[PDB]
Design a protein around this ligand. Structure first.
Ligand SMILES: Nc1nc2c(ncn2[C@@H]2O[C@H](COP(=O)(O)OP(=O)(O)OP(=O)(O)O)[C@@H](O)[C@H]2O)c(=O)[nH]1
Ligand SMILES: Nc1nc2c(ncn2[C@@H]2O[C@H](COP(=O)(O)OP(=O)(O)OP(=O)(O)O)[C@@H](O)[C@H]2O)c(=O)[nH]1
Ligand SMILES: Nc1nc2c(ncn2[C@@H]2O[C@H](COP(=O)(O)OP(=O)(O)O)[C@@H](O)[C@H]2O)c(=O)[nH]1
Ligand SMILES: Nc1nc2c(ncn2[C@@H]2O[C@H](COP(=O)(O)OP(=O)(O)O)[C@@H](O)[C@H]2O)c(=O)[nH]1
Ligand SMILES: [Mg+2]
Ligand SMILES: [Mg+2]
Lengths: 142, 58, 426, 430, 439, 427
């Protein structure tokens, strides 16, 4: 999937915030709230608050509270739901699939077909202008 | 402006009423609209500003 | 309330400031005569930030217009908003700079800086409290590049705790306007790293790209690019003039933006930009502002932050919006593409929400972004500088005015330090 | 107030200044009487009766060419004292116009220039019109630009000279005075806009479709070039370029100050309205070597700096988009030590037409000036033409009897040899 | 909540969309400029326009469609016509040159530069819809753009959305009359790429609607504008249940579940019952019993093929207007007692019904009478296999002596796809032979 | 958007192009001073196909005028529509060819061919996208038949993508206004068969037959002859310039017209030609237009399609008609006349419908016909070439400019093979 072919650090800015707002609209009409746009903050899976969560006296409170490995079915819908599947299917190409939206400002004047009477001048459509392009003469050699 | 359909013909045929040079000698859209075009950011340029704040509506 | 002193230097600075004060006067409902013709009381409750009060219910400028040519004073005085400006704020010499930074800073910018300093001192002593100073200029010239930095140095000498700002039209990537433009740009950036708390880089090729694709208009003048620049010039001082749920001044944005005093170069942008023929079809929502908010074809500097990575991001929002949705959008844009944000700091986006939008626009948003991809501008500038310096080209127009040769080299060293120091945070 | 004062020395000077000041009166409201029915005061001065006198000085050593001005319809426009005439000619002799006859005319010319500058509160430039192959334009103009450097100092003096043509020459001793007027001014000038008559002959033959042009027909286009070089002094525009701009921004070294002039749209009124004169086609018109005012091919050399000035329907976006089109063709060439290369000047005022002129009424005009290393062939041809006739001391005895000596020929020859070595050294990449 | 997105490809596609979107704008209260009349204010609860129209900020309704064509000659008529302020400027995607009845140009060279733009626009339009559940493809089999570019489009849409349903409405060639000499080539080649990359393929024929217009209506010498309105009517009846309340709402995935038995059988027939003028319907007391019967007659079909010599496999009725289920059941029971209508052995019931509570609408001008009820039957039959039995005869005649192939091999196309498209068609017509065998 | 570039070479091509720029400027509402003066806004929409812009809204044609002798250009410059042409597009020489293929291809067109290349590249690269090159000339001349072929060879070498449109005035059977035409025509049609996409053969005898019985004209002049083919040659490219229910550009009328690249010689016609004294004695309907299409008295070539076949056929209808009436007319004509159509191609008639009738009619059409009965045009030329070759009649006028006899032999070897291939597909 690299038909656009920019520099490969491009095509990866994702840049879709209206998609996560248009699929939160699905559960406005639904009564069972399953997929929202805020993901849950599970401190176990979180890579930030592990200092408290690897020290002592934590496993005695984990097994007895039925949390040892704000909702359980919401995680199943967050990582298996049709909203997340649609979100991931449209995120394989980070930027757009077109050359216009992957372009920043470095592809502004790139093609730029130059156009140029004659080629270096010297109109000679008149045959008096072709037998000689100057009544005085021409110098050098080109 | 836009009568022949060559390059960017939709936009100014939809925008003759905003960029009509009145009449003068020469009279291009360079000495006219030198100090700014008309309706660049907002097509309704004279609607009054909203007097609604957060606390004055809640 | 804190009032802001505006300064314009050179032809580019004066032409930008004319359009800027035009759009400020429309946003506050001030006619070209100078009286008040607005509809809301919110427009007059904090008009003292930019406008001094006169007799007769008319409002008088807090702005200084400086150039070495008298020919550009007639151009702004005869402009569409030209009669509003104070006659004592026009400071001007007789002979021009010549796109020479040397006489723009040493020979001819020296006898003129006393008059400008007298004007600034005479008018900023009338403050109750003063926040800082704004300056619009260009680095590829002789007036706004030369004396635009000497002025910054002298106000830094006088008031050190105020907020010096800069909206500088940086030199272009592809086609230049002056051949000695790399010299002036290199010599001006060297004075802009120790004397400005914030500085915005504006490039004309970026604005050309906006006016070609996004605005879709085929014959744009300099007024349209000036309007685009001034849409974000006013977009950073909204919370000083209109109330909101989450205010943010320039000092707060500077504090939340720059982590060290040598990275204060930004990339501005404006959200609700679309063509006139397709304007009434766009459904203005906060996600739709976010979608082309962070798009890098909606930048005013001719770099690409997708190439590098974001040290921080600002977002000043105007209009009716939900507080959950702005944090939702500015957390989604952080969380999805985690390779474009620095990781030695938890969050990068600054949130600011105002609720008085521009006239006729339901919502709007303004961008300030600091990235490590801005090093490509100084890299190219220094490459051209050292290509032009090893042959001693155009040098006698600098050295003959009372200026030594090593002052080029120490500026090159400072800019190279800036280039190599930005690489540490990639 | 952005005044500049012109000095017209010699027959070429006055016959160019007539067309120039006719154009200046035409695009202002100035009648040939002087009365009227943007920035005006740069070239004219008000009086108590509504008259707008100009600020130019006409200088020649024979009265056959200024007395025609004194009896025409512009008799009451020019100042009576600002037209200077001698009693007898310099007789195609540099020594006569430098040492014997031009020694006691400078006391009047300097007084007139000082009288002009005392009413000039914003003086920022000088314009000198002369010819390299004359006796007054070679000798007296060299004395003037020698002395103005001492009297006025760091004022910008840019002169618009006429190089002798590479192939044709109305005179014969022209490569003597042309050699001697360069060595004595290379340290006394700032920028030298230079045109050849032969290239303008070719242009009026093939661009305009006219045959058998007259000197006034060339002078119309030559004065139209100067009206586009001081257009930003007189009219408001998006990008003003003053007279002191050119020397900072066109010449890299204080020995080489010789660019080449070019006017892009030159077309008869019968062929103007069948073309598309967009920005992409008029900025390209300054680059094919058939359209240059100096008959030298820039294909040999490399461009050093360029300065394009625009008029009329500008719209600065496609000026950039059309200059960027020049970079993609490999036939154009640039030095490696000037990676930027170009200058952009934009003015709102469209060019005006003259009654009887062969030019059309257009909305876009480009006047481009560029110094190129390809000018080294002009100096090489003048080099060879000087040592072809100095090798046997052809016309030397005329010069040595008029207050000169033998060393001035050899000194000037060595000077231009050093100049040619400089031009050869510049054109090396690394 | 039940959004659908339609894609119109080619001149045939955009001209079908021209007469179809006026019908859409007349089902709801949408003015030709895209506004509401502001005199008929609707309740805030119902969202009948949300299936086809997207509500903008102030009051404007912008349709969910893509008009894409390689030429500018027909879609510039759209934005200079009487509907120019209704469509988005960027939903009208146009190329620069056509394919000129060439599959090679539109699939390999001239269709490949603007496939990215139309993909980006479809993605940008799909980022606003919530319950995206269908795609409508309007193109032409016998064209160059509508056969080549559309094939690339639904070759590339499947890799983007995956299992989403793709219903298509294509103009199949006619046996007697036609338009071009080369459309057998462009019709066999599209059978290879849209067979496995689509879910249900309704096909129409331009000559079978001509006899409907001559015989049912009294419209003599009709143009294309009198033919595209029938396509608008049938496509509105199919998506009628998605925006109007009814007794038996039939969702989009219910169509395909009992319209296709086998994965390679998605080629049903199409018909519309009360196609009648005002003069003839004024004198005719018809009923449910023979708007049900008229759709089973061979002369009322929109593809030239008799169902007399072909087994029916899966019929799907849709009813509009004032319809109770009892006379529908009675009419269906009277279908079961007819001998000349035959059914396959493995289908016990073979009938799907759906009742809607909205009568069909009428347009200014036009010729159709305003009737209370209408029937749109999507009959999946085996008799459509003989429609391919003429097109393959249309191919090998020119294929024997290599005519017009040199226009194909030059533009990025190798010869080896005629010889596999023909074998794909042979396997497809064997697949329909297997299902008709008694066992 | 799909621009075309018009080329015309020689006296015949110059006069034909002059009449063409009369009629198509009258159609688009172009005043002879170069200003638009019409009524509808549909004429200005697609005016770029044949015209360009200028300063002030003037419309100059994209036509390039060339001949060796300026004896014709200065007559058409001072004519009715002469001042709209670009004054630089006229390019010419001192000494003309004078009915010789040799000089205008090897010694006098060889130094003027770069001139037309200069002008055609300047006009070609300034447009957005090109979709054809139009050439009108004659095959019996010397500066059109020889220089035109060299021009097509030099242009097709540079742009192999684009399409070549040639309108060659083939000589008539009973008429010979140039004795050395079997040499020039053969050498011209040798070079045409390898470079052009579609060739429209026009015979002047067929034009005289049209003005004789079809139009009831007593004084048929050469302007009357030029207008008749100018109507057709402007009716071919209708669908580019006007909206239609079925459009067909130059490529559509090439893909659906030639089954093989060596079989591309066409045979045009134009229906609604009746006398002003016989106009209301027949209604203007589709059956009348389609009958008078295929009638033997209404085509511009002097060959009869009874002794041949029809590989494929195009006909661009133009005006306000129905569609299925067209389908009936172009199906029944194949049904009854099946013995005069090829059987291995199922349908042969390609149809296209525009919606703007010409200025002054209700409904019109235009015939484009590939027939295997066009080989009778080349049988006569081959016979006359063989008759002038055994005695070497005018051969020494051709060797004097850098030629040889094997070029003539290979031209004949191309012609007998083209005729043989047409005859092999006749059965
Ligand atoms: N293009 C142009 N060239 C001119 C014009 N007038 C004079 N020249 C050139 O300038 C030179 C004039 O030289 P001279 O005839 O000696 O006149 P001079 O320069 O005043 O020198 P003296 O006669 O000694 O006073 C000639 O060689 C001409 O080629 C003019 O009107 N237009
Ligand atoms: N029913 C119906 N058929 C149409 C309509 N327009 C075109 N067609 C059919 O479409 C077929 C070919 O049209 P296109 O799809 O445009 O063929 P194409 O090669 O794509 O032509 P271009 O679009 O110009 O490239 C013809 O045989 C017509 O029968 C229409 O409006 N209604
Ligand atoms: N965006 C923008 N740029 C401008 C404007 N006016 C001038 N410039 C830029 O300023 C640069 C040259 O500035 P300059 O004339 O040297 O300013 P000076 O110092 O007063 O001479 C050019 O590159 C222009 O692009 C304007 O109105 N808008
Ligand atoms: N129909 C028509 N044929 C012409 C016209 N002028 C010349 N011809 C034909 O041109 C052929 C002779 O070509 P010729 O005049 O020699 O072309 P040349 O080389 O330009 O002189 C003859 O067969 C004529 O029928 C014209 O105005 N109309
Ligand atoms: Mg003299
Ligand atoms: Mg089409």
């Amino acid at each position: 999937h690299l038909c656009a072919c920019p520099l490969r650090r491009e095509k990866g800015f994702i840049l879709d915030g209206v998609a996560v707002s248009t699929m939160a609209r699905s559960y406005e009409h639904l009564r069972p709230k399953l997929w929202s746009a805020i993901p849950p903050y599970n401190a176990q899976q979180d890579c930030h608050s592990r200092r408290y969560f690897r020290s002592r006296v934590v496993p005695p409170i984990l097994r007895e509270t039925d949390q040892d490995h704000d909702g359980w079915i919401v995680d199943y819908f967050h990582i298996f739901g049709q909203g997340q599947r649609y979100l991931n299917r449209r995120n394989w190409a980070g930027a757009g699939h077109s050359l216009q939206q992957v372009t920043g400002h470095d592809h502004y004047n790139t093609n730029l077909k130059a156009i140029q009477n004659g080629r270096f001048g010297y109109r000679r459509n008149t045959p008096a202008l072709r037998h000689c392009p100057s009544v005085f003469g021409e110098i050098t050699r080109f | 402006r836009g009568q022949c359909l060559l390059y960017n013909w939709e936009e100014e045929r939809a925008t003759n009423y905003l960029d009509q040079v009145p009449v003068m000698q020469d009279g291009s859209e360079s000495f006219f609209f030198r100090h700014g075009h008309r309706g660049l950011l907002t097509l309704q340029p004279q609607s009054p500003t909203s007097s609604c704040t957060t606390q004055k509506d809640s | 309330m804190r009032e802001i002193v505006h300064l314009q230097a050179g032809q580019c600075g004066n032409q930008i400031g004319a359009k800027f004060w035009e759009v400020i006067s429309d946003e506050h409902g001030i006619d070209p005569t100078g009286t008040y013709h607005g509809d809301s009381d919110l427009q007059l409750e904090r008009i003292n930030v930019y406008y001094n009060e006169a007799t007769g219910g008319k409002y008088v400028p807090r702005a200084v217009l400086v150039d070495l040519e008298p020919g550009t004073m007639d151009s702004v005085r005869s402009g569409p908003f030209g009669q509003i400006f104070r006659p004592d704020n026009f400071v001007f010499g007789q002979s021009g700079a010549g796109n020479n930074w040397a006489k723009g800073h040493y020979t001819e910018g020296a006898e003129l800086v006393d008059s400008v300093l007298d004007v600034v001192r005479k008018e900023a002593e009338s403050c109750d409290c003063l926040q800082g100073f704004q300056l619009t200029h260009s680095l590829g010239g002789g007036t706004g590049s030369g004396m635009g930095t000497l002025l910054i140095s002298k106000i830094r000498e006088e008031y050190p705790d105020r907020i010096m700002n800069t909206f500088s039209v940086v030199p272009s990537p592809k086609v230049s306007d002056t051949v000695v433009e790399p010299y002036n740009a290199t010599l001006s950036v060297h004075q802009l790293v120790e004397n400005t708390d914030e500085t915005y880089c504006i490039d004309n090729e970026a604005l050309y790209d906006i006016c070609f694709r996004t605005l879709k208009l085929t014959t744009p003048t300099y007024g349209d690019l000036n309007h685009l620049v001034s849409a974000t010039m006013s977009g950073v001082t909204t919370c000083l003039r209109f109330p909101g749920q989450l205010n943010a001044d320039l000092r707060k944005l500077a504090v939340n933006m720059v982590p060290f005093p040598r990275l204060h170069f930004f990339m501005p942008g404006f959200a609700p930009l679309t063509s006139r023929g397709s304007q009434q079809y766009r459904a203005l929502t906060v996600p739709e502002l976010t979608q082309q908010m962070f798009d890098a074809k909606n930048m005013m500097a001719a770099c690409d932050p997708r190439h590098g990575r974001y040290l921080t991001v600002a977002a000043v929002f105007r209009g009716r919006m939900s507080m959950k949705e702005v944090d939702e959008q500015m957390l989604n844009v952080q969380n999805k593409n985690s390779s474009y944000f620095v990781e030695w700091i938890p969050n990068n986006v600054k949130t600011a929400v105002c609720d008085i939008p521009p006239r006729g626009l339901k919502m709007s948003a303004t961008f300030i972004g600091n990235s490590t991809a801005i090093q490509e501008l100084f890299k190219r500038i220094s490459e051209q500088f050292t290509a032009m310096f090893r042959r001693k080209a155009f040098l006698h127009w600098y050295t003959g005015e009372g200026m030594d040769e090593m002052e080029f080299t120490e500026a090159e060293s400072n800019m190279n330090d800036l280039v190599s120091e930005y690489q540490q945070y990639q | 107030m952005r005044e500049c004062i012109s000095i017209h020395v010699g027959q070429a000077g006055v016959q160019i200044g007539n067309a120039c000041w006719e154009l200046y009166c035409l695009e202002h409201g100035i009648q040939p009487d002087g009365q009227m029915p943007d920035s005006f005061n740069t070239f004219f001065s008000e009086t108590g009766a509504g008259k707008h006198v100009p600020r130019a000085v006409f200088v020649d050593l024979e009265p056959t060419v200024v007395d025609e001005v004194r009896t025409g319809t512009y008799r009451q426009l020019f100042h009576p004292e600002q037209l200077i005439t001698g009693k007898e000619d310099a007789a195609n002799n540099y020594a006569r116009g430098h040492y014997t006859i031009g020694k006691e005319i400078v006391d009047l010319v300097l007084d007139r220039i000082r009288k002009l500058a005392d009413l000039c509160t914003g003086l920022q430039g000088f314009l000198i019109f002369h010819s390299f192959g004359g006796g007054t334009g070679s000798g007296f103009a060299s004395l003037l630009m020698e002395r103005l450097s001492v009297d006025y100092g760091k004022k910008s003096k840019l002169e618009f000279a006429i190089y002798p043509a590479p192939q044709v020459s109305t005179a014969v001793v022209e490569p003597y005075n042309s050699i001697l007027t360069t060595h004595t001014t290379l340290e006394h000038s700032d920028c030298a806009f230079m045109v050849d008559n032969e290239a303008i002959y070719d242009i009026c033959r093939r661009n305009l479709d006219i045959e058998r042009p007259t000197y006034t027909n060339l002078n119309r286009l030559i004065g139209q070039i100067v009206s586009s070089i001081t257009a930003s002094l007189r009219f408001d525009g998006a990008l003003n370029v003053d007279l002191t701009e050119f020397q900072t921004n066109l010449v890299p070294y204080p020995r080489i100050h010789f660019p080449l002039a070019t006017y892009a749209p030159v077309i008869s009124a019968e062929k103007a309205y069948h073309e598309q004169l967009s920005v992409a086609e008029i900025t390209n018109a300054c680059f094919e070597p058939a359209n240059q005012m100096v008959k030298c091919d820039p294909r040999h050399g490399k461009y050093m700096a360029c300065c394009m000035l625009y008029r009329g329907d500008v719209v600065p976006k496609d000026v950039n988009a059309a200059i960027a089109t020049i970079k993609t063709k490999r036939t154009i060439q640039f030095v490696d030590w000037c990676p930027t290369g170009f200058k952009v000047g934009i003015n709102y005022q469209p060019p005006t037409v003259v009654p009887g002129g062969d030019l059309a009424k257009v909305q876009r005009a480009v006047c481009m000036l560029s110094n190129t290393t390809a000018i080294a062939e002009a100096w090489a041809r003048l080099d060879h033409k000087l040592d072809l006739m100095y090798a046997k001391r052809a016309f030397v005895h005329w010069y040595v009897g008029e207050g000169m000596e033998e060393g001035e020929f050899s000194e000037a020859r060595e000077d231009l040899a050093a100049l040619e070595k400089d031009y050869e050294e510049v054109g090396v990449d690394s």
